[model samples]
Target: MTNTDLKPLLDNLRNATEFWNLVAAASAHNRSYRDALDWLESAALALGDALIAQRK
Candidate 1:
């Protein structure tokens, strides 16, 4: 695979980042700190899976 077409998939990260940034707000849009922690755990697992998938 080549690196010429990464933006389409990578653009979703911007969406995720925006979601997390908004979720981290302390008021009006107050959300529990646990949400980030939850994503951290899921992110680790997802990254592990992605790494293996990319190895082929």
Candidate 2:
């Protein structure tokens, strides 16, 4: 396994938790809702990509 910078990535995911709360319940703030959904997508992808490096 290789060392991957997790701090930054996890932070994004950590924030996704809060964003999830907002979007999961649905938000009238369309901008907030959309960005949260966007962050969730990117954050999940990042973790998948970063963790996959452990196999190398």
Candidate 3:
């Protein structure tokens, strides 16, 4: 994909990680296992996108 197309993916990667961290912190208190799992999946997807962009 072109660099332009990858920009959103890059942003998603950053946002996903930040969101995951926030959710993880919250889960520490509320203990929502499902939410944590969702966040983990999002982070993983974003990480994959980021790695793909970097490769390109």
Candidate 4:
């Protein structure tokens, strides 16, 4: 695949980054620490899945 084909991947990365950042902030400000860790872990899994999908 070409760079053009990776546009959506880039967008997904941005979205995931934003989500994970918010999760971190929430954890720092009194949201459940366990929940925030879970969210960050889940986001990593999601990014892995998306990368696999892009390869196909």
RMSD of each: 4.6, 2.9, 4.2, 4.4
Please list the C-alpha lDDT of all candidates, in the order they appear.
0.54, 0.81, 0.67, 0.64
lDDT of 3 at 17: 67
Span of ten consecutive residues with least summed lDDT in model 4: 29-38
User: What is the model-wide C-alpha lDDT for candidate 4?
Assistant: 0.64
| Candidate numbers sorted by TM-score from highest down | 2, 4, 3, 1
Model 2, 1-56: lDDT tens digits are 33358878888998997888867776344788778888888999998898898668
For model 4 the local lDDT of residue 4 reads 73
**How many clashing pairs does model 2 include?**
0
Q: Which pairs in model 3 have colliding backbones?
A: none
Identify the runs in model 3 with alpha carbons over 4 angstroms from their true place.
29-56
Judged by lDDT relative to the true structure, which candidate is superior, 1 or 2?
2
Q: What lDDT score is found at residue 46 in candidate 1?
A: 60
Report backbone clashes per prediction.
0, 0, 0, 0
Model 3 per-residue lDDT tens digits across residues 1-56: 56885677667666666766777676473455566567667767876766677786
- The TM-scores of all predictions, comma-separated, are 0.41, 0.71, 0.45, 0.47
Candidate 2 clashes between residue pairs 3 or more apart in a chain or in different chains: none
- Measured by TM-score, the strongest candidate is 2
- For residues 1-56, what per-residue lDDT tens digits would candidate 4 score against the true structure? 45775666566566666776786776474455555556556766766776688788
lDDT digits (tens) for residues 1-56 of candidate 1: 33543453344455555556766664342344466556555655565566577778
Worst 10 residues of 2 by lDDT: 22-31
**Top model by lDDT, which number?**
2
Q: Following a full C-alpha superposition, what root-mean-square deviation does model 4 have from the true structure? A: 4.4
